[PDB]
Amino acid sequence: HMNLCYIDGKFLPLEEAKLPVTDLIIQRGVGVFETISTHSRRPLMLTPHLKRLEGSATASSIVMPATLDEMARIIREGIKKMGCETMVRPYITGGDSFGKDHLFSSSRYFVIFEEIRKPDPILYEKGVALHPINAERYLPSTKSINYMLSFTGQRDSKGAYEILYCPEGEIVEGSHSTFFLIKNGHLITAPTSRALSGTTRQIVLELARRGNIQVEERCPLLTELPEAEEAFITGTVKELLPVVRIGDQIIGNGVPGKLTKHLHQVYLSSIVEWLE
Amino acid sequence: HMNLCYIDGKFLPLEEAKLPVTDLIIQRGVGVFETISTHSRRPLMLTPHLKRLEGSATASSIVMPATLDEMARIIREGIKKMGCETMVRPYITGGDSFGKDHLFSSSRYFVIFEEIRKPDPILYEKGVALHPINAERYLPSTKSINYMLSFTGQRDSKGAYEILYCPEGEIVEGSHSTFFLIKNGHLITAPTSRALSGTTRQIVLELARRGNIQVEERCPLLTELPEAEEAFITGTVKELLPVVRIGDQIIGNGVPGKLTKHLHQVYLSSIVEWLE
Numbered sequence A, B: 001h002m003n004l005c006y007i008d009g010k011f012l013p014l015e016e017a018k019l020p021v022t023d024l025i026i027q028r029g030v031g032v033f034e035t036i037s038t039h040s041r042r043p044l045m046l047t048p049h050l051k052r053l054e055g056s057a058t059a060s061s062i063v064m065p066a067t068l069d070e071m072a073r074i075i076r077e078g079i080k081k082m083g084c085e086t087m088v089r090p091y092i093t094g095g096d097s098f099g100k101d102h103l104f105s106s107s108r109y110f111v112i113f114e115e116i117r118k119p120d121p122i123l124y125e126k127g128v129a130l131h132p133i134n135a136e137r138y139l140p141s142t143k144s145i146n147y148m149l150s151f152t153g154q155r156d157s158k159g160a161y162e163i164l165y166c167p168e169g170e171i172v173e174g175s176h177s178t179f180f181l182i183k184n185g186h187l188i189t190a191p192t193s194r195a196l197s198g199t200t201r202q203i204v205l206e207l208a209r210r211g212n213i214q215v216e217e218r219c220p221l222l223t224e225l226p227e228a229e230e231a232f233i234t235g236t237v238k239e240l241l242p243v244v245r246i247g248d249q250i251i252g253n254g255v256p257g258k259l260t261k262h263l264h265q266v267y268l269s270s271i272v273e274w275l276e
């Protein structure tokens, strides 16, 4: 499929788009981004993602190089050009210098558009296995471009779907996901002091509120997994994806659970509410 | 001289060099690098730096896109072109994909050459102030491109020379430096399990051995700074730089100390031994 990069006023073929090696995104990993998905070629949680992008940029001392309205206009135009369900990634770079004011004031920006790659249907029927590691994301409210740990953590993950950040036995989040445990019919998920404030997470808490499902905002523990009924990971692209194994531990009876399948169905039935 | 970037077979002006936005260095912070300085237009600790670059690349699941001999040849050719004292940074990128083998096997590489920017002479006479933060580099043996913390740590550093990583009151290293405390005429410095295995650090331990100066390889503590005589930070470019203040704490008498000045003099008198 055709893939785009919006950069410097133009929607380029993604393979043509290039960034100056002066940019501190390249030299020193100074960059923040979001991942935005579409349903019916409309962006899911567009405003919440763009507010989170500005939040990341501000927390990283980056001055936004475009307004949120302009980032929204570009995203909409690139989706129109794609003419398919799209995964969209707006990037904000450090640019060429850190000023005497302790800000990155010449930030660059670009927006990647790719045909969306949903997890295979079989993964929703089977559920996935997570690989726990003794590590976590620093400043986890900020979605920087530093995802090195998500790949080096796979060195000994032996083909697990995703890495799970379990610093000192406390489950925080996936490398690309919010993590939820189900224990005695209630949700357990790490607080926003430890894990990224997921857009999908924020919708799942709202669905829990609507369904009178109790939510405990505390880290699930690896040692609680034998008492767990179910588990799932959330994000843009993957939606709610059942977790049936973590390390050598089977979750409940090792197939996707009733409350997971329920929350996924309600999510998909309700999803247009959060489209823009 | 014009600052250069060796990329794709050519020495470009640094500001003209560009990298495809497909590269996972940009998208996901997948990259490792080294910083190499010159004395008499010869690269200092060239082989130790290139072995540390390979070590970073291997620890990050990156297959090296060039041999160490070829990285050496480029470094030497660019220094010859510069015809001045140079700070050199070979970068190894993740490239466009993480393979089914859990390796980045289409890595890109580039080499930046800049006219060297030594600390002002006044900083060696005065000494510098460090700003301690409650944070640390993950996988600190690996020198990845993720230096975001080195900038976000400056948010409330109020103009300190550098950030000092002091997780839970244990001093590990600077954002760009190895850290040394002097107490009762012995050196204290964090072990290589905690801090980057600095080239400058490795020379200073050797100078300590030659001078019969005892070295304790443990993290100095913020709480022991009142009992400290001296402190200094080491690296490529800065050499040995006296530290006379850490947060609100003056180090000894608040001027560069006798053993710091001695180690810096011996380092500069001996430096040709480590040039290549």
Ligand SMILES: Cc1ncc(COP(=O)(O)O)c(/C=N/OCCC(=O)O)c1O
Pocket (backbone or CB within 6 Å): A034, A035, A087, A089, A117, A118, A119, A147, A175, A176, A177, A235, A236, A237, A238
């Ligand atoms: C299946 C899936 N789940 C979750 C995520 C969210 O992960 P982050 O992007 O926040 O790490 C993505 C991201 N795709 O990103 C676009 C496709 C790609 O970057 O390869 C994804 O593809």
Ligand SMILES: Cc1ncc(COP(=O)(O)O)c(/C=N/OCCC(=O)O)c1O
Pocket (backbone or CB within 6 Å): A034, A035, A137, A173, A174, A175, A176, A177, A178, A196, A197, A198, A199, A200, A201, A234, A235, A236, A237
């Ligand atoms: C570290 C992390 N935690 C949690 C999440 C889930 O948050 P939402 O997606 O629900 O807002 C993400 C999103 N990645 O999205 C997929 C990875 C990507 O393509 O960049 C993430 O990167």
Ligand SMILES: Cc1ncc(COP(=O)(O)O)c(/C=N/OCCC(=O)O)c1O
Pocket (backbone or CB within 6 Å): A027, B034, B035, B087, B089, B114, B117, B118, B119, B147, B175, B176, B177, B235, B236, B237, B238
């Ligand atoms: C004064 C000084 N000390 C120490 C370092 C070592 O720090 P790292 O590179 O390992 O973080 C550098 C690096 N210059 O790098 C070249 C100029 C620059 O990147 O701004 C430096 O200029």
Ligand SMILES: Cc1ncc(COP(=O)(O)O)c(/C=N/OCCC(=O)O)c1O
Pocket (backbone or CB within 6 Å): B035, B173, B174, B175, B176, B177, B178, B196, B197, B198, B199, B200, B201, B234, B235, B236, B237
């Ligand atoms: C994080 C960190 N620790 C310690 C050091 C000291 O290592 P050596 O330089 O002695 O091998 C450096 C080097 N920066 O290199 C110069 C500063 C820079 O360009 O970041 C560093 O980046």
